[PDB]
Design a protein around this ligand. Structure first.
Ligand SMILES: *[C@@H]1O[C@H](CO)[C@@H](O[C@@H]2O[C@H](CO)[C@@H](O)[C@H](O)[C@H]2NC(C)=O)[C@H](O)[C@H]1NC(C)=O
Ligand SMILES: *[C@@H]1O[C@H](CO)[C@@H](O[C@@H]2O[C@H](CO)[C@@H](O)[C@H](O)[C@H]2NC(C)=O)[C@H](O)[C@H]1NC(C)=O
Ligand SMILES: *[C@@H]1O[C@H](CO)[C@@H](O[C@@H]2O[C@H](CO)[C@@H](O)[C@H](O)[C@H]2NC(C)=O)[C@H](O)[C@H]1NC(C)=O
Ligand SMILES: *[C@@H]1O[C@H](CO)[C@@H](O[C@@H]2O[C@H](CO)[C@@H](O)[C@H](O)[C@H]2NC(C)=O)[C@H](O)[C@H]1NC(C)=O
Ligand SMILES: *[C@H]1O[C@H](CO)[C@@H](O[C@@H]2O[C@H](CO)[C@@H](O)[C@H](O)[C@H]2NC(C)=O)[C@H](O)[C@H]1NC(C)=O
Ligand SMILES: *[C@H]1O[C@H](CO)[C@@H](O)[C@H](O)[C@H]1NC(C)=O
Ligand SMILES: *[C@H]1O[C@H](CO)[C@@H](O)[C@H](O)[C@H]1NC(C)=O
Ligand SMILES: *[C@H]1O[C@H](CO)[C@@H](O)[C@H](O)[C@H]1NC(C)=O
Length: 426
């Protein structure tokens, strides 16, 4: 929470808002934060990073000969700060680090950094298939928090007293980060319901090649079904937790607006430019960027951006750039951060590729066109998830991104942190 760090907010600063060719991001890797493992069987996957008010929470999953979070035998929780080391750029300083008490039984986690302390919201279960075979009464939900001087403490969330805005059999914390607004945490969630209660207008308004044997209404209704258990529907939502000195809890679970639904996936809430931005990874037929600022909390309603440029790679009938309704599952999580509201521009580390997860490119865009880009590595680089957060450092916009990278295929896999500066000139 240094004098150098300030949330990116207030009046716009001076930097490049336009097309630019070969710009200077001042791109540098950060190597001392993420732990190192000599055992090449261990796979450090699904990095998560949330940054608020000068402090960061970092989370990553470690598992043996598997890159899946439920297979992780250790899940890592780090707390740190953003500081001026005097090299004219922001540096990450790592205060404390711990392992989740329940790591072996951890299904999924989401970080949120609040009041200069780390919070980690976890869905932990003895069933790895729990979001198919089971319900949320049989699993457990925890909050692990620490500030780096302290001892980490984890408390069970009273899910039994939760209020819901619909009848859900299951839910998981899924995404790259959450926010704290006042006394309440809000976490990206995905819900499971066994009957089809959803209305797809947006999907149904699409006139294009549609396979014979099924109606638009039909494939749209069916596109929200869990590809593992077809009798279940996965719908994104938020969980709001009121908390008093971490004692009296008020939990309520609401579903996302029905306006432009997409199959339930990981996504995130973030405070930026004095607003709250929701991102949702696009795992279904609509392959373009799905995100928006939150105009209305009940029902949870982000004003969805209409974006014709930013997309993601996937194998199957929904590769990059493909917007026609279809029943398909896949794609990668690349979340975004806003720079200027008036010029409507955002930064994201996106994969430049159609079917394959690789070639991370730092991209700066408006909703219509891509203003400018730079490949992170000059050599071909294998990469899956990317998270990005931005801020003001010495009164200039700077970003920190974590890339989920597999460098030497099947060798020791660790995510890589990078930092860069938004160009002052075009
Ligand atoms: C697919 O999802 C359905 C929906 O919950 C599961 O069906 C339930 O299974 C539990 C498990 O014992 C029963 O208690 C319920 O009575 C079932 N409900 C219905 C409506 O059938 C089913 O188990 C899932 N299948 C797989 C293979 O995961
Ligand atoms: C996951 O399964 C484990 C093992 O059965 C459960 O841990 C035990 O829970 C019982 C309560 O029924 C306690 O009496 C034992 O002391 C626990 N064992 C240990 C080693 O702590 C656990 O409750 C289950 N949790 C979830 C979320 O399913
Ligand atoms: C983070 O800090 C803010 C203020 O610094 C806390 O906000 C207050 O929380 C108490 C509960 O202990 C409420 O009674 C007040 O109404 C809140 N004030 C405002 C202005 O919202 C907030 O609870 C803190 N969050 C955490 C997780 O510690
Ligand atoms: C993306 O386009 C939609 C329309 O295709 C915009 O939706 C409108 O939003 C305004 C402000 O919320 C409403 O007054 C209109 O009624 C909406 N029209 C609809 C829903 O058909 C939407 O605002 C656009 N995205 C952004 C970020 O402005
Ligand atoms: C987003 O920013 C881009 C910046 O390139 C805008 O594209 C330009 O729009 C101006 C109009 O002010 C034209 O003179 C340029 O020729 C456009 N450039 C290109 C490469 O097409 C775009 O209009 C902006 N869109 C929104 C919604 O703000
Ligand atoms: C949940 O627990 C709290 C105390 O922690 C209690 O006051 C409340 O009544 C419980 N909810 C239900 C539905 O019993
Ligand atoms: C649907 O496609 C036709 C082209 O066959 C086009 O003329 C029409 O404007 C489109 N309508 C919508 C709502 O997309
Ligand atoms: C909760 O906050 C109060 C101040 O409002 C403080 O006195 C108390 O020590 C805190 N709780 C614990 C368990 O320390």
């Amino acid at each position: 929470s240094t004098n150098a760090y300030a949330e990116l907010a207030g009046p716009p600063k001076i930097f490049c808002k336009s097309v630019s060719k070969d710009p200077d991001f001042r791109l540098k890797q950060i190597d001392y934060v993420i732990p190192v493992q000599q055992d090449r069987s261990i796979c450090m996957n699904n990095p998560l990073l949330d940054i608020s008010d000068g402090f960061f929470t970092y989370i990553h999953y470690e598992g043996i000969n598997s890159c899946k979070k439920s297979d992780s035998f250790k899940v890592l929780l780090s707390h740190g700060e953003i500081v001026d080391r005097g090299d004219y750029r922001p540096s990450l300083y790592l205060l404390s680090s711990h392992y989740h008490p329940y790591s072996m039984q951890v299904i999924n986690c989401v970080p949120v950094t609040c009041n200069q302390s780390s919070f980690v919201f976890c869905h932990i279960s003895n069933n790895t298939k729990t979001l198919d075979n089971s319900d949320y009464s049989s699993d457990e939900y925890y909050i692990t928090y620490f500030n780096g001087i302290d001892r980490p403490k984890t408390k069970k969330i009273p899910i039994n007293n939760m209020t819901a805005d619909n009848r859900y059999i299951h839910f998981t914390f899924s995404g790259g980060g959450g926010v704290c607004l006042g006394e309440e945490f809000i976490i990206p969630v995905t819900t499971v319901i066994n009957t089809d209660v959803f209305t797809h207008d947006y999907c149904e308004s699409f006139n294009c090649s549609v396979q014979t044997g099924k109606s638009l209404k039909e494939i749209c209704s069916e596109s929200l079904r869990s590809p593992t258990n077809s009798s279940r529907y996965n719908l994104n939502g938020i969980m709001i937790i009121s908390q008093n000195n971490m004692t009296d809890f008020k939990i309520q679970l609401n579903g996302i607006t029905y306006n432009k639904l997409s199959f339930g996936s990981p996504g995130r809430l973030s405070k930026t430019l004095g607003q709250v931005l929701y991102y949702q990874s696009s795992m279904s037929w609509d392959t373009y960027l799905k995100a928006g600022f939150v105009e209305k909390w009940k029902p949870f309603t982000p004003n969805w951006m209409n974006n014709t440029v930013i997309s993601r790679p996937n194998q199957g009938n929904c590769p990059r750039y493909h917007k026609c309704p279809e029943i398909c599952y896949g794609g990668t999580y690349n979340d975004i951060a806003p720079l200027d509201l008036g010029k409507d521009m955002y930064v994201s580390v996106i994969l430049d590729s159609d079917q394959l997860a690789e070639n991370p490119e730092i991209t700066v865009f408006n909703s219509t066109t891509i203003l400018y880009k730079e490949r992170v590595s000059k050599d071909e680089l294998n990469t899956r998830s990317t998270t990005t957060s931005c801020f003001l450092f010495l009164d200039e916009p700077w970003c920190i991104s974590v890339l989920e990278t597999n460098r030497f295929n099947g060798k020791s896999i660790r995510p890589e942190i990078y930092s860069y500066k938004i160009p002052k000139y075009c």
